[PDB]
């Protein structure tokens, strides 16, 4: 048996490009006191991405970008400014399903303090950002496979509101789709959840135990 305790914001998506790597040991990009940008839409274009980087270089902080995808010319700006004037940026794919992604990115928005870009209703566009529209996190670690965000700052009342919302969701939720728990574990992290990995030498043993 092993007890693992998770706290933070973990999800299974990795940097889009190898050029983002910072550590050379492990091949990770490791950041602290970072900003986070959250885009519900794809980021291909330049004109939507650039102010978000100017605002980052202004306040001399590393930037993590989470999006449906980041590619076209945007990615080119990202790894050019990364490779030539050691700017601290990474870009990663949205946790990814379809309609689930909206709740996940809005979760990360609420946790890290800040707002999601792209179309919900009231649309905030990527061209007009302010530092209070981003996100702020104690630490960030990214690999080829997975992304972890740590010590994100936001309204604790509003986050506990969020968890109170998801539990009251799942409890009445005649569902074979357990991702609501996968959501709930995330927004509970850095308050925390404990996973109990049970051992044994054979499946039947593992199930009885």
């Amino acid at each position: 048996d092993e007890l693992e305790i998770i706290e933070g914001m973990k999800f299974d998506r990795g940097y889009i490009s190898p050029y983002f790597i910072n550590t050379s040991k492990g091949q990770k990009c490791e950041f602290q006191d970072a900003y986070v940008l959250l885009s519900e839409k794809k980021i291909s274009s330049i004109q939507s991405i650039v102010p978000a980087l100017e605002i980052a270089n202004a306040h001399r902080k590393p930037l993590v970008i989470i999006a449906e995808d980041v590619d076209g010319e945007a990615l080119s700006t990202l790894v050019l400014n990364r490779l030539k004037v050691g700017l601290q940026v990474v870009a990663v794919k949205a946790p990814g399903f379809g309609d689930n992604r909206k709740n996940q990115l809005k979760d990360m928005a609420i946790a890290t303090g800040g707002a999601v870009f792209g179309e919900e209703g009231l649309t905030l566009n990527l061209e007009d950002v302010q530092p209070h529209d981003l996100g702020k996190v104690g630490k960030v670690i990214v690999t080829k496979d997975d992304a972890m965000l740590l010590k994100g700052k936001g309204d604790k009342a509003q986050i506990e509101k969020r968890i109170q919302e998801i539990i009251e969701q799942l409890d009445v939720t005649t569902s074979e789709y357990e991702k609501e728990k996968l959501n709930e574990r995330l927004a509970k992290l850095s308050d925390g959840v404990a996973v109990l990995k049970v051992g044994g030498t054979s499946d039947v043993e593992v199930n009885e135990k």
């Binding site: 274009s45 330049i46 100017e54 080119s76 700006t77 050019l80 004037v85």
Partner: protein, 100 residues
């Protein structure tokens, strides 16, 4: 009408050099050379004799050489002189001149 790099544009036509576009915008952040555009500020470098129309006598083009000018985003045809890029527009198509 006046010419440039041994090239004289005909009737109403004006030849212009697009002035080189931004690599380091505003703040401090660099951009890829082709990213998504054509730059719409250009200096005129050659001029036609004129269209002759709206009369019987030639009517000369409305811009003189060396003016700063604002192009439309669609029209005009590319031409290359001494392995450099210049662009050719009708005098009517041009939107604006820059004054000192």
């Amino acid at each position: 009408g006046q010419a440039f790099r041994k090239f004289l544009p005909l009737f109403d036509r004006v030849l212009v050099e697009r002035s080189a576009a931004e690599t380091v915008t505003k703040g401090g952040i660099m951009l890829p050379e082709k990213s998504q555009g054509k730059v719409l500020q250009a200096t005129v470098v050659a001029v036609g004799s004129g269209s002759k129309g709206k009369g019987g006598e030639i009517q000369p083009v409305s811009v003189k050489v060396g003016d700063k000018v604002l192009l439309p985003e669609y029209g005009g045809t590319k031409v290359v002189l001494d392995d450099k890029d210049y662009f050719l527009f009708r005098d009517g198509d041009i939107l604006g001149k820059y004054v000192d």
